[PDB]
Ligand binder design. Sequence first.
Ligand code: KLQ
Ligand code: KLQ
Ligand code: CL
Ligand code: CL
Ligand code: MG
Ligand code: MG
Ligand code: MG
Ligand code: MG
Ligand code: ZN
Ligand code: ZN
Ligand code: ZN
Ligand code: ZN
Lengths: 270, 69, 270, 31, 252, 47
Amino acid sequence: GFLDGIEKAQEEHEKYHNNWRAMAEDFQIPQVVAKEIVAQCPKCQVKGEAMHGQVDASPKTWQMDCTHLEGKVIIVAVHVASGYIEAEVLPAETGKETAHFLLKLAARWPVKHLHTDNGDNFTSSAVQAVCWWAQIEHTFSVPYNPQSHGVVESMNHQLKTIITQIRDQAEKIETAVQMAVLIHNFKRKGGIGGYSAGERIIDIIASDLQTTKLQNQISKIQNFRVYFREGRDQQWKGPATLIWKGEGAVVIQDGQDLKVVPRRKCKIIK
Amino acid sequence: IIASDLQTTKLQNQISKIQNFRVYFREGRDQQWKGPATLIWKGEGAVVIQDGQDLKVVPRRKCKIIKDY
Amino acid sequence: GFLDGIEKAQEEHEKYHNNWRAMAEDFQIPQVVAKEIVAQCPKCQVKGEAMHGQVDASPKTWQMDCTHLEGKVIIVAVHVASGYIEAEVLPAETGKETAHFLLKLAARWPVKHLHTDNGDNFTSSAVQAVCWWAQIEHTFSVPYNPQSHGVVESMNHQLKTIITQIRDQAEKIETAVQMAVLIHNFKRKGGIGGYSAGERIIDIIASDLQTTKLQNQISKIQNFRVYFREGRDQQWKGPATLIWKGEGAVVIQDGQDLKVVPRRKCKIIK
Amino acid sequence: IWKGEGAVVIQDGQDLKVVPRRKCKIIKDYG
Amino acid sequence: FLDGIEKAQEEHEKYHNNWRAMAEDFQIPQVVAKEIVAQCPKCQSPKTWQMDCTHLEGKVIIVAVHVASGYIEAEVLPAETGKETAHFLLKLAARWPVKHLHTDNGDNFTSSAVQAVCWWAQIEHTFSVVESMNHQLKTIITQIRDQAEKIETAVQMAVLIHNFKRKGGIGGYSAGERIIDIIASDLQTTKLQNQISKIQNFRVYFREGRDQQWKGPATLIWKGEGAVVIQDGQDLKVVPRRKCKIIKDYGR
Amino acid sequence: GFLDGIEKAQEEHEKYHNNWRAMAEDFQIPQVVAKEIVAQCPKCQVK
DNA sequence: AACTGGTAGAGATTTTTCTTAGC
DNA sequence: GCTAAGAAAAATCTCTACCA
DNA sequence: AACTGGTAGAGATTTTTCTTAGC
DNA sequence: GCTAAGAAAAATCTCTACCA
Ligand SMILES: O=C(NCc1c(F)cc(F)cc1F)c1cn2c(c(O)c1=O)C(=O)N1[C@H]3CC[C@H](C3)O[C@@H]1C2
Ligand SMILES: O=C(NCc1c(F)cc(F)cc1F)c1cn2c(c(O)c1=O)C(=O)N1[C@H]3CC[C@H](C3)O[C@@H]1C2
Ligand SMILES: [Cl-]
Ligand SMILES: [Cl-]
Ligand SMILES: [Mg+2]
Ligand SMILES: [Mg+2]
Ligand SMILES: [Mg+2]
Ligand SMILES: [Mg+2]
Ligand SMILES: [Zn+2]
Ligand SMILES: [Zn+2]
Ligand SMILES: [Zn+2]
Ligand SMILES: [Zn+2]
């Protein structure tokens, strides 16, 4: 048998910390036992699970960060769904200047969600009062994880490369910062629609407003309710709103949730 | 009387085998690996763990979740 | 036409530094002209070509580097084709101790090619005299490019993880270094043949010697020369040595070069 | 098939090909 | 196939050949030839090292020698305590597979530090070749002494000349080629033994020609693509695969 | 882990001589080790 | 004119092996 | 006795951090 | 119990467009 | 007049460094 091999393998891992293939080959135990012996050791288990996530890309989400260049402090804000950049040079990295930059940005463009890191200027009472008055949801990243806001750190890189390209056409650094913002927003194309960033933010916000008005006018004159049968149990749920009846399935709304149900499990009543 | 205890032990066995997981995470400025903690919520990208009566949010790229057989 | 658009596009790139899609869309020139306008600018051209190379993996090649741990200086050497590790703790990072480590290594295992970085201990007259006496070819990497010796830096990582696993079983750091070398060489399996590193270096060197002796005995009694026709011009080359005649092609040796020629372009003479 | 000084001839899936010496590993592979 | 097995058994009954030669001659697989050797009543170390210390020019030289090949590893010690001997033994066991250590009844070899190292690395220590190796190393050291400044350089240069530059023995091999061939042959033996045990955990019910009934449980030796070799009644025989049933066996 | 389950199932089969599906469901060990426990007993047989 | 990224582990997906019920 | 469904155990494939 | 990597450019490979010779 | 070979120009796909 191999039960004595299981005991000798546990003593061997306690001294030498083998991996599972070494024990499964030298003691001739099955591989599930060797994997369990390794999985019950706390001196091992030093490795993550090797995947990446995906940030939020809603049409009113902004991300914000600070960078340094030639002894100055730049503050960068990016519109995530389009790539649109605003930037400024601060005299100090306090919370007063960050609150004023956020107030001017919220006065110019519609902001509803803001994502930042845990720096001392972004976790401040002045930024808290500005977000309260202008009705913004402020969310913070997991600490010491800059991948949670990857768009604004990538735009830090793009801004610094443009600034080194056009540095000899200006005298100060604030002039070169604003020239780099103009070159990024309007003079570089390529991406989703072949647009620049200014054309893309115009298209995204205009499309948002147009599609809300269109489907308000559609949904205010609707009828033809649908009773449908779904779930693990074959029950029947009540009044659902038919949205679009298609070649193969229908789309219903139930309790402010969108669902796609085929034609065999639904009945339409006028 | 006995049959009710059979049903209670079966239901408690399924409840205990649903969500008994351990988590080894990596956190802080100097990112070291720390001891076992209890999994609470698992979304795509990050997890919420309870360690020493403290709730922490760790990404799924910096933690290992060990199940049971 | 678009020739005036070409002139306006050159002035526009001189001021703003557009990419090629912006100029090709705003001035309606073909894309080859816009790519040429960007390619003649020296303020641009800041990007590599996005590939990787492949290091040498001959059966007698070694790579060497130094690392630091708890205020000490470790020196690591790796056999590249198998993954076999030797390591030591040096009292100083000079050239005398590096020459003595290389002399002991060359006395134990056959070394013919050594690859290092450009540190001050590896570019030294003592290491030069040891490589001269023991007949080793010493090659150095491109400066500030650690990817040229990736095997020894990866083994620096593996050694430090094992040392933190077994640190509480020893008192000093030299003891823990030698215990980590034993655990890496003999207690971890998985890889090319399911081997450990010690089994793999034994298999590689034994296979090298066996295959030289076998093909010496084969080639000392050979005959059946082959005249073949190849090249852009249909000429005929002289005496070539037939090695293996196969179903579809033959393998010949010409001027100590191996070639594979099909049957239609070769004639065998006994 | 044949091991040279700078090249190695192998048969791979009924295809004879020539690889450089620094891109090969020759094992007997007990297993 | 079966003709090869019959000729292999008759030739082993005459001359008692080894299994590598029988497999290469009679063109049978290695597990069958190893079973033919293992069934014979008359037919039933690569990891042993020796250590010693010596003196030269007021220094202490410690020498370890692989016995079956004559392979030398040497060093210069600053003292003769048990901690330095334990460090030399730990470095040696970390570089080569050491299973059995043979020494004499010195003080530094009979120590708690050496005992702790042998406990951790699982070596069998035995107290009682190295005299001949000390004499040979001292002759090479005196032969090349004018090329080195210190004694440590001359010691390691003599170890290199002993291991790779001197040829002798039967075929004219050095000590490094001999130690590599010995350890590689032992590795081939252990891998084949793992395959043999994993195959021999099965069982075979076979049906002979001109019958409908299954015979007794014969042990499977080799399971090919079209044929099956079994051991039954102290006899090795080849059955086609369409008259066989292989089932798992639990007879521990 | 199920290693304490392996030890407890060995004590339980030494008393009552269980089968392998019973031990694999009661002690939550994999089926191969439960079949090996039944195989090593000289009085029982896996079936 | 002759230089160069790699190693090992965590999960996910595909494949092979083993027991048992049905005809 | 033969065949197929089901599940367990093993093998392969893609992706990540760290190495001054 | 409600969190998360991304951006843009350098080459390689596949596809579409345009001129011209042959039947 | 119709059709196909050949080459130029455009479109798509995979892979890399840097962002405290
Ligand atoms: O950055 C280092 N490693 C990290 C790393 C890697 F390993 C592999 C990668 F693909 C990428 C990486 F980022 C690293 C740096 N240096 C040296 C190293 O050996 C070394 O590994 C070294 O010895 N010198 C000497 C020679 C001149 C002076 C002293 O500076 C250099 C600095
Ligand atoms: O390492 C940084 N970037 C590089 C990088 C990246 F951008 C994206 C990646 F996927 C990987 C990367 F390696 C980086 C570090 N820190 C901050 C940054 O904003 C920042 O970008 C920051 O603000 N703080 C404050 C909050 C607490 C204190 C001050 O330390 C942190 C340090
Ligand atoms: Cl942070
Ligand atoms: Cl360097
Ligand atoms: Mg920041
Ligand atoms: Mg940042
Ligand atoms: Mg270095
Ligand atoms: Mg290095
Ligand atoms: Zn462990
Ligand atoms: Zn330019
Ligand atoms: Zn015999
Ligand atoms: Zn029993």
